[PDB]
DNA sequence: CGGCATACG
DNA sequence: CGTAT
DNA sequence: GCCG
């Protein structure tokens, strides 16, 4: 009944199995912390199932022949359901590494590997790195600076005013060109830790050399707080009341050609791509990415004119982005 | 046991 | 190395 | 950690 694979199931925003899922996503991240990406991929697989259930796990019986849930992710459920509590995630959680390396990994700049050597360095608090900016990066000094409006979430009312002024410097840019939310917000989140814009043009070949235009142009607004090609991360400068507060916007150019690839892409989750990208290549034996679908057999690019064309092109019932929650 | 998504800056 | 979904 |  339930597929094995995220995108061969609608996933929603919210379901009704959060706590359970939670769980399992704090010992997928604090898999990643020590590197091991195959333990991080199960853990937030079988979070990902309990989101596409129709009504709440209950007991431990209505986990058999759920993909993904062996003997290590049906043990935490036991025990959340048993007690209230699995004693491994609540040892993670309070851990000094785990709360360590997330708060370095929260860095804009700061990958696991940064975060991992300056652990083993001793280091453990913000003012540890402050106490030594020689060792930072300009994106991690940026990182730092901000790290504080950076936490606080990204509303969906902020979200229009800074499309409206993309919009103006894309006007300006290139006469024609689009701006299309994309990321989480396009899911239907009604916060986020940052904004997404996928940019376009209808003609073919006009999107060239398009994104400097529109940074120089949002840098000359005094809206670019930091920056540093296609893709842009930004810190941007957002008004508030009396005030402003740094925000985290990426900017995206694509072809119009390739536009239907990039905003599938883009869209998410991060785990239903992976998901999508996997199913194609291992059951479609076709190559997908950001920019196309690429059959290797013909030595072939499959054309795109929508999302739509894309899972029907792998054999895949429709989603809509709010179903693609994995 | 191999595999685990796939890019760009 | 970092970044993105 | 789990699947095929
Ligand atoms: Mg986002
Ligand atoms: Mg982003
Ligand atoms: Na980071």
Not at 153 to 179: C, F, I, K, W, Y
Not at 211 to 221: A, E, F, K, S
Not at 254 to 261: K, L, N, T, W
Request: proline share 6%.
């Amino acid at each position: 009944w339930m597929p094995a694979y995220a995108c061969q199931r609608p996933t929603p925003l919210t379901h009704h199995n959060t706590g359970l899922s939670e769980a399992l996503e704090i010992l997928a991240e604090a898999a990643g912390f020590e590197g091991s990406e195959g333990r991080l991929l199960t853990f937030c697989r079988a979070a990902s199932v309990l989101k596409a259930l129709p009504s709440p796990v209950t007991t431990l019986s209505q986990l058999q022949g759920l993909p993904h849930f062996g003997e290590h992710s049906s043990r935490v459920v036991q025990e959340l359901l048993e007690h209230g509590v699995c004693e491994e995630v609540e040892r993670v959680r309070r851990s000094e590494r785990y709360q360590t390396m997330k708060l370095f990994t929260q860095i804009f700049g700061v990958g696991v590997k940064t975060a991992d050597r300056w652990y083993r360095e001793g280091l453990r608090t913000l003012d540890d790195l402050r106490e030594q900016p020689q060792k930072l990066t300009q994106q991690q000094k940026a990182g730092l600076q901000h790290h504080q409006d950076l936490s606080t979430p990204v509303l969906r009312s902020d979200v229009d005013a800074l499309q409206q002024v993309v919009e103006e410097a894309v006007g300006q840019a290139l006469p024609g060109a689009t701006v299309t939310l994309t990321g989480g917000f396009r899911r239907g989140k009604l916060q986020g830790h940052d904004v997404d814009f996928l940019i376009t043009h209808p003609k073919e070949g006009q999107e060239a050399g398009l994104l400097p235009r529109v940074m120089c142009r949002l840098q000359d607004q005094g809206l670019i707080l930091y920056h540093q090609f296609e893709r842009s991360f930004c810190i941007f400068r957002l008004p508030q009341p009396g005030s402003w507060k740094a925000v985290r916007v990426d900017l995206v150019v694509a072809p119009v050609s390739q536009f239907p690839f990039a905003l599938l892409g883009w869209t998410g989750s991060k785990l239903f791509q992976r998901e999508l990208r996997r199913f194609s290549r291992k059951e479609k034996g076709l190559w997908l990415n950001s920019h196309g679908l690429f059959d290797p057999e013909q030595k072939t690019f499959f054309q795109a004119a929508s999302e739509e064309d894309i899972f029907r092109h792998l054999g895949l019932e429709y989603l809509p982005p709010e179903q693609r929650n994995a």
